[PDB]
Structures are given as C-alpha cells and as structure tokens.
Amino acid sequence: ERYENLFAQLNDRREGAFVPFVTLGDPGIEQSLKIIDTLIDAGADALELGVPFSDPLADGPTIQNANLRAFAAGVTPAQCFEMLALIREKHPTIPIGLLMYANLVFNNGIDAFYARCEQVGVDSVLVADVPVEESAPFRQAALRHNIAPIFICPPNADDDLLRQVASYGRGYTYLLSRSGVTGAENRGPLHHLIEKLKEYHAAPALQGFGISSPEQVSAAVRAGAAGAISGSAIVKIIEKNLASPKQMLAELRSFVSAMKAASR
C-alpha cells in the first residue's frame, strides 16, 4: 500500500511525484547505498532501481554503462536483494520499484523471485521485456506476494490496451512519453491517454523516458500525470563524477532538489 499512501499524500498536497532511477551497485555497492540516501534526502518521493543485467535491450548508452559499471564492481542479484533489505530498514515508507529483464525473474522460478521481493520490502516490479500478452504468470505471482505488477502504456496505445493496462496494473501506470529506448538524449501530448486511464480507474500514471529538466516534470503534472521518472539525467551525474564521490553526491542533491521543486 506504499504507492497508494504516497499518492494520497501528494494529492492532499496538490503535488506531483519525482522518481529518480539508478542501477544498484553503480559505481560500487557502498557508493550506491550512499547515492540512494542522498537521492531520498534531496526529495525523491519514490525509487526505481535497476538490477544489473548483461543484456538491457530497452536501455540507451547511459544506463547501458550503469550496468557495465555495476558488473565491473561485481554486483550480483543476491547482493542486490541484500542492498534492497537495508534500504528498506533505513526508509520505511518510500515506494521501491525494481526495473527487471525477464530472464532474471524467470531464472530461479517466477514465484520465488516475487517471494524474495516481498521478504525484502520491494513494492513493485516492471519487467521491461514482458508485454501484457505475455504477463499472466508475472502478474499472478506479483499479486500473490503483495507486489505491484507495473505495465507500460505506449504513447500510441489503442483502447483495448488502455483497458488491459488499467485492469492488470497496480501501484502506478508507466506512461511512456516516447517510442525508442531510455536516454536523456531525446525528449520527444499525452492528455488523451492520461484521461482515458483515469476513466478506466488505472493506477496513477508516472511519465517516463526523456525527462531531464524541471520544466519537464511540471509539464507532466499539468497534463494530468501523477508524477515523472528520470533516469539517464541522474546516471549521467554519477558517470561525470566517478573520480570524486563527494562531488557526485553534492551534484546529485542539487539536481533532485531542483527536479522535486518543479512538481510542487
């Protein structure tokens, strides 16, 4: 009920949600844990965390490199769940969503993956390469372990898809602002989808892809979305400041404070 509570709270405050993305273990475990605490302290409303995968086919260069850096550090899915448990032990109410690729959740059995998420305190799971057509087993397993199955609503979704996404999803609806892959490189009107989803009582929408400036988050809120997700803009700050961990944290702070202010 973490997302439910968060959204009610932001609504009472007439505010939009700012949700940053980072890869667990980038550039290292200790520095990553440190990055995440800074993100929260600077104002993040929720978190979208990617576990290192060898073949991230829905991600552009920036996030592709985040996975590579985590791999260089030796981060494994087991170490990720350990990281996830501690993040929750430190922050009791912040919604935590995992960005996963299918093989990592199917690998040891679908049911067992969602059981582990529950145990650690994860709130939602988005599997980037599983369309609604192939979602049944992931959906069912997530629901069985009180985990929200996140579905993606393309900018060109037809009515049948909107109706499906609204019925199946929970936590939040992932509103894609663009075709293509993740990247602050390309920016790329969602009023119709946002209204239709509301009509079908879908979970609150969070706009993702290409969001890298504060004007972009205010625009998302203005269009009717409950918030915005920003990844490459965040990871780029890590990439830029690798030789200065202290500089990194300070720079991350300014950016998410600025980004969060725009949702108010």
Place this chain on the structure above:
Amino acid sequence: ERYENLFAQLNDRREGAFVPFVTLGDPGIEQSLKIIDTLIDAGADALELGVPFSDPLADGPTIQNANLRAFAAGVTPAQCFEMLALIREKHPTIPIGLLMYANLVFNNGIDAFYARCEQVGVDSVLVADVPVEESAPFRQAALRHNIAPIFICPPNADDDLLRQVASYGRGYTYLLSRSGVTGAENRGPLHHLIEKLKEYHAAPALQGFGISSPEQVSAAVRAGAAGAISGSAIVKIIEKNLASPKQMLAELRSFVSAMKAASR
C-alpha cells in the same frame, strides 16, 4: 655438303662422329667463342648450337640454365648470327647445326631465317617443336637455301614415320634414345630403327639424349649409328667452372678428347 663429306671421311676411317652441344653466348660471347674453339681442338667432329630462347620446352634443367646464363649476358639472335659467321671464318669444314624453337625462325619470316643461315655458313637446322606433320614450310625453305632440315626419329617410331623421316631429312637423322627432355640425368635398344632407316636410305643417324660417358658413344657406333650428340654433360662443365674460365676450358678438353676417343 659438309655432313656428307664428314660422314664419308669417318667411314673411310671406320669412326663414329662425336658432336657436342652448347648454347651460344653461355656464359658470355667471348667465353662462348673460346669454349667452341676448345671443343673443336679437343676433337669435336661437328657442332650442335642452341640460340637462346625464353621457353625451351624440350630441354631439362641443365640446358634451361644455359639459356638463362646467355640471357643474363644479353645475347640476342642477331649477335648469334655474328658469332656463327666468325666460327665459320675460323673453321671451314666442320658441320654446324642449329637447335631452334619455332617462334625464332617464324618470327621474321621463315624464308628469311634460312637465307640468313646460308649467308653465315650454317649447315643444318633442327626446330625442336615442329613435328613432321607441321614441317612443310620449314623443310621447303631449308632446302631452298641449301640448309639440311633435321628430323627427329622417336625410339617408338612406326613404319610410316620412319619412311617420312627418311624421305624428308638431310644431313643427319636425329635418333632419340629416350622419351622426355634433354638431360645427362637420365640414360634410358635402337637396332631396329637404325636398320630400317638404312633400308630407306635416310641420312646417317646421330644418337642424342642422355649420352654422357665414353662407353655410351662406343655403344652407339656398335649399334649401327653414325655418331652421338652430347649436351648436358658438356654444359655441366661450364656451369661447374663459371668462376674459373681457365679451369673450364681445360676440363672441357679432357672430356671431349675422352668422348671422341670412344668413337674410334
């Protein structure tokens, strides 16, 4: 009438003819002229001289290299005829036969080549790559300029061939003791051919190919042949003594004296 006279003379002496072979211009013009005088002084009855050709397809390695050495010296067919004229001006009665390949005689016109041979004092011409089947124009041109057209009688010649060779040739009949190419490397009974040629009043036979020792020339005479031709054994002495011209001449002398003695 040089061959005619020579054979009558050797017959009166109950002797066989010893005929050495060398490439004109090997290893150089002046040294070649010197080699030829030594050959005659040591006892050669006649000469078989090859003019340097780029593609001597009836010759083994030894003679292949003789052509190469002459080429390295820059000997040309024009320089050869000059060499040939002087050899005759020095030696009035010794029969001189040229070993030619077809392109060199056809090149400037067949008739003109034989005219040049006459002018220089050449006695016969053997074109290695012209069988009896293709000989008409060469035969006719040779006869027209008082040059003897030499034909090759293979060790496996049938009656028709023997009859042809006997009718067409003049000077001497080239009796091949072997299949293959020139070379003292391989040695390889001609009684039947020798008798049949005599029957058809062919020009006296000279055995050629593989003759490299004195026992070989005595055997040739014993079988009924009028003499023997030796090339690779001769050229090998030149090859061996390139760094010592004086040694060359002395070694050539001993060999042809030995070879000539065996025909007596």
Place this chain on the structure above:
Amino acid sequence: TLLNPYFGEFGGMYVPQILMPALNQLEEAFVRAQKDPEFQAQFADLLKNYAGRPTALTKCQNITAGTRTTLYLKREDLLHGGAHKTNQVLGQALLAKRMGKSEIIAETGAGQHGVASALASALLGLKCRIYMGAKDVERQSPNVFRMRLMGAEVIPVHSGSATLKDACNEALRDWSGSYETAHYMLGTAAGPHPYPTIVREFQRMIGEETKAQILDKEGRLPDAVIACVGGGSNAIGMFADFINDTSVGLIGVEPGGHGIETGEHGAPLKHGRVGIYFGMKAPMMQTADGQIEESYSISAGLDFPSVGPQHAYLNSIGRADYVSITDDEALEAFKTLCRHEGIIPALESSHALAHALKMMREQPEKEQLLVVNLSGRGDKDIFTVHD
C-alpha cells in the same frame, strides 16, 4: 495473434510493449503474402532466376565406400552467396516491401547474414543498416568489406561482450524507435513470433526439394536427414516437409566446441537451461545467476547462444533428436569431404557431415539412406583450418 506463437512451452513474444504492433503487423503481412499467388510467383522467380534454385542433391560414393550407408548432400553451398541464408532474406525483403517499408535492419555474427541481407537489399532497393559486435568486425574484415561494397551501412556495437548477443540487442533498440519505416530482418529461426514461423516457411524449399529429388533418385524417403544447428534455420528448412513422414529421422547437430565437459561449447538445446531472452522462451547459454553467456565453436557461424523454439519442442516430444560434434570432429569431416568428394564445406556444415560419418563408421553394416544438408561453402574457412 492469427497464428500460435508457441511450440509447446517454447517461443512467445517477449519484447517491450512498444514493439508489439510491429510484430502484429509483420504476422498479418506474412499471412496475406502466403495466400497471395502474386507474392508467391515473385518469390519463386527470384529464387530460381537470381539465387540458383533448385540446388543439387549430390550422391557421395567415395566417402561411403566399404559400408552399407548411402549418403547424399543437399547442395545449399551452391546457392547465390554460398549459404542457405539467401532463401530467407529474399522472402523477408519482399515482406518488407509489401508493408511499404524502405529500410532494413540486420544483425550478424560471422558475417553471412549481413552479406545476405546486404545483397537482398541492393537487389530490391532497400536501405540496409547492419549491426556487428566490435569483436566480430575485427575478426571479419572480408565480410564487412563485402557488405560495404554491396551498399550496406555497417555499425560496430561495443556494448557487453561486443559479439552476436550485443548486435542482437542494438538491432531491437534501433527497431523500437524506427519500426514505422524500417523492417528488422532477423537472421535465424528464433527470436519473437512471428520470426521462427516465417524463417521456416521461407527455408522450406530445402526439404521440399530434397523429398522430390530423393524420390526420383532412390524411389524411397530417407532414413534420416541431418543438419547443423546454430540458431536453427537451415535445420528447420530441411526438417519441415518431413515432419509428417514419421519414418524419416530428424537429427540436429549442435557445436560441442572443445568438448561438452569443458564447458566450452555452443549446445544450449541439450546442455543449457531454459530461459527468456531475445524475445523468446528457449534453452540458453546462461550463468547460474541468469546472466546471458556466449556460445563457443571453431565455426563462427554456430555462435547464437540459444536455439529456435521449434527445435526445443520437436526435441521434447521425441520427433527430432539432437547431438553434438566437437571442433576436431568437424575438422576431420571438413578434411575428408575435400579429399574424397572435391567439395569444400563450411565448418558449420561440417558438424552435420561429421555426424553422418559417425553413424556410418560406427555401424558400417547398417543399411542406411542418409541426407546431410550442406548449408554452405567453405572457401571462407581455408585460413582457419590452415593455422
């Protein structure tokens, strides 16, 4: 969907939501085309007059001397381009054209699919983009140069292991943002539906022709048809028309590399673990954690880290049997065909030959009528088997 995306438990459509309409579009176009005699006549014309179809079925008398085995080789090595891949790409290019598409996206490891895609695009007026891992481009300059000469744009991918896996990643990344103008010409009978079905249907000539040819020459169907399995296209092309002929054995050969026991191989179907990747549920080269791994083989063309879903299915129900052949085993078959038959086989194809050779040699007195699919020419491998 109009067609079943699964072959039992295997197959599916595991791609990001954004790419679903592209797959549904392709499926509809394929169903239509298959019904269209005009499309059919066009495909047949290119196959016959441009590619060299029908290919020969050659009896190998020398190789089987002294045994009771009769061996024939389906001559795909004689197809324009020197490999079976050409059949496939011509049909997919016509499909792209039928859809109003003007661009072609393609992935390649060893270079063959890239060369085939580049030639089909040059002939049919399509703009071709090819992704190749930086490691493969370095290792494959002759094919890169061929692709470029044919007008194709070659793009090196430096991500991950910088090999096939990664090229396959980049292609879909590109396609997710350009599907409206470009068509993704996938190189094997794998990936998300409708690709496994489409590639099979566009590779079907192989077995169809082999059937008529063997019936003419032997008046009997073969006892078994054998084919190497990299991703599965040449194999399924051979198998398809014989699936309903229950007396005909179907044998697929996977690369054993330095030996299964060394872990240095490319045999996921028989020695990997089922996973979900490349828009597909299928056996895969994978770590215990589920991180995708590379396939290894002396033959660069047998490096696809997974296998077609139809093969995984044909195996599970017992219709087809899969085996493996090591690098040395394939080298020997390569050497043998050169010396006794005067044919230089691709090292890929040599794995299939090596197995028919084992079948013979192991039981010399067994009467056996065998057909090996010689999927390609081996001029390509002369240097490899040289060193």
Place this chain on the structure above:
Amino acid sequence: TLLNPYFGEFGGMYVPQILMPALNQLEEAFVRAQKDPEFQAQFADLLKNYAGRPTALTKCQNITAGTRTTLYLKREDLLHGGAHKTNQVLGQALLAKRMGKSEIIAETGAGQHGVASALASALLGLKCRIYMGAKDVERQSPNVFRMRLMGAEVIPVHSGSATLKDACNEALRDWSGSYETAHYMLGTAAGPHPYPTIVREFQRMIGEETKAQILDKEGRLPDAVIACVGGGSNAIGMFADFINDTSVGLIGVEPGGHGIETGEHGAPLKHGRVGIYFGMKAPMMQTADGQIEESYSISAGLDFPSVGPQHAYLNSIGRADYVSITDDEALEAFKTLCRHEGIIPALESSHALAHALKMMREQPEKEQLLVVNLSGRGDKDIFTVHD
C-alpha cells in the same frame, strides 16, 4: 588426324615429335566419346548433380534503368568451384579415364584451373600433379592451399619468369616423358590440337543453355553475347551455339591493363603479333626478336600471353569482334554490379560487364538485348579491389 587442326591460318600441332602419338590418342578418344551415349549420359549426370547445371540466366533491371538496353547475365559464377572452368575439367577427366589413364597433369596461373583440376581428380579418383610458377604460388596461397586440401601435388616452377608461361613449359616437359600413364588437362581453349576443339565442345553447354533460356524469357535471340578472353574457353563456350545464328553478335573482351598505349596490357589478339608457341600458331605477347612476353592485367586470371586459334579465326573473317577494357574500367563494372545487383563478379568477368556497360551508356537510346557471360565469382578479388 580425324579432325581439322586449323581454324583458317591458326592452330596446328606444334609439339616435339615425341608428343604426337599422345595428341593422336586424345583426338581418337574424344571422337569416340562424343559418339558414345554412355559417356554423354555420364558427363550430363556429373554436370547436373555435382556441378549445379543448368546455371541461371539473370535479368539485371537496376543496372539498365533509364536506357533502352536489356541485360542478362549467364550465371557461371554459381557453378561448383565458382567458375566456368569446372565444366571442362569434368569432361577431360572422363576422357582421361576412358583412355585408361590414372594420372592428371595440370598448369595454373591464378589458381582457378588448378583448383578445378584438383576437385575433378579427387571426385574421379585420379592422381593430380599441378605446376605453378613460383611467383604465382607466392601470390596465390589460398588457391594453393585449396589444391593441397583436395589431394593435389603442387609444384612451383622457378624457370624463366616463374609464371603461367613457365608452368605451361614444365607441364609439357613432364608430359613428354609420362604420356603413357598421365593425361595433360590443359586449362583453356588454346594449345595444340585437339585441345582448342575439345575445350570448346566441353564448354558448349554455356551458350546452348543461354539460347533456350533467352528464347523462353524473351522469345527472341540476343543482339549480342559478350565474354572476357584470357585464353578463350568461357568465350568460345558462350559463342559456339550462336555461330550459325548470323544476327547474333559475338564480342570478346581482352584486358587492356594500364592502357594499350602503355604496352602494359594482355591483348595479343588485337595488339600482339602472330607467332608459334605453346603448340600453336596464334597472336602472341612477344618482343621484336620473338622472345615470349607476359600479359598484364589487374585480373590474374587473364594472364595467358596468347589466345585461342578459333578466336583469331573468327576475328579474321569478321564473325566475331574483339575489344579491350582497362583495369579502371573493369574496377568500375565490379563496383557497379555489387551495389546495384548484389552480385560480386570475378575481375575477369568484370571486363565483359564493363563493355556491355559502355555499349549501354554510349548509346542509351539504342534498343539492345545483351547477354554477358559472368564466368566467375568475385569473393576472390575482394582484397585486390580493397587496397
């Protein structure tokens, strides 16, 4: 002889007396074989089921766009081995076998004839000996390795210029001493009779097939058939069946190298001088003294220093016309076919293409139905056109 050794003034049998019975033997065997339906059925079977006959006749729409020329390419590049040479060697191998011969002697420059002779011998159980000038062996390691893999003995000749000329010399030297057990498989439609006639008859399928194919597809005979001329085999194979069709033009293309005017070319038929060499009276690359010279071309396979006697004759009476094409001209045709048709042509074949391209481009409004003989595959030349 049973057949006429001359084509007008050209041809003949200029070999040492010792080799005459070998030539008379070969002629008789050929006449018999030609009459023998069993030999004919055997040759046809190998051609069809082993080599890939009939080869395609491909229409090139892209290349001729915007002109009134219709161009077709006879696909000899699709023949087993990648060149037309294969047709020839199979027939000559069966002839050797019919004679009770068990050994094969062969000459090669660029390596193609050697590869073809080696494969025919491997298939038909003959012991193959191949002579190659030391310069060519150094310059042709891929083909030498192919020959060796196929079981053939490769022997470098260091005499003379250590190239084709010299390899041709060594082969006859060998043959003069081994004709009783070995057969000399000459590589082109040249040399002493009966070779020019035999090679033509064993290369005749090319034009015969082209005729039926064009009649089917166009219902008319071509306006002209074009072929490159190294020694003359692919050209005469194309021309033969059309000689009596007077309306069909016959165009042979000789290599112009850096340009006729530079002296750096390989065009003896139109720019050399008649001589007597290689057991033949024919136009030749020669010095003023009559010393035999080398032919030059970007294409290694067009380096035979003379030309077939039938071509010299067809030229003298006006039945066929011969032209030349420079290295750059051939490079352009090579590049063009790759990009517009997706076919990589041999640089040899590219000289013929380059001429059809000139014919088109020079008079774009002339209605012309042309056929180019694509004698071979160009995978071989990728590195050459690369540097």
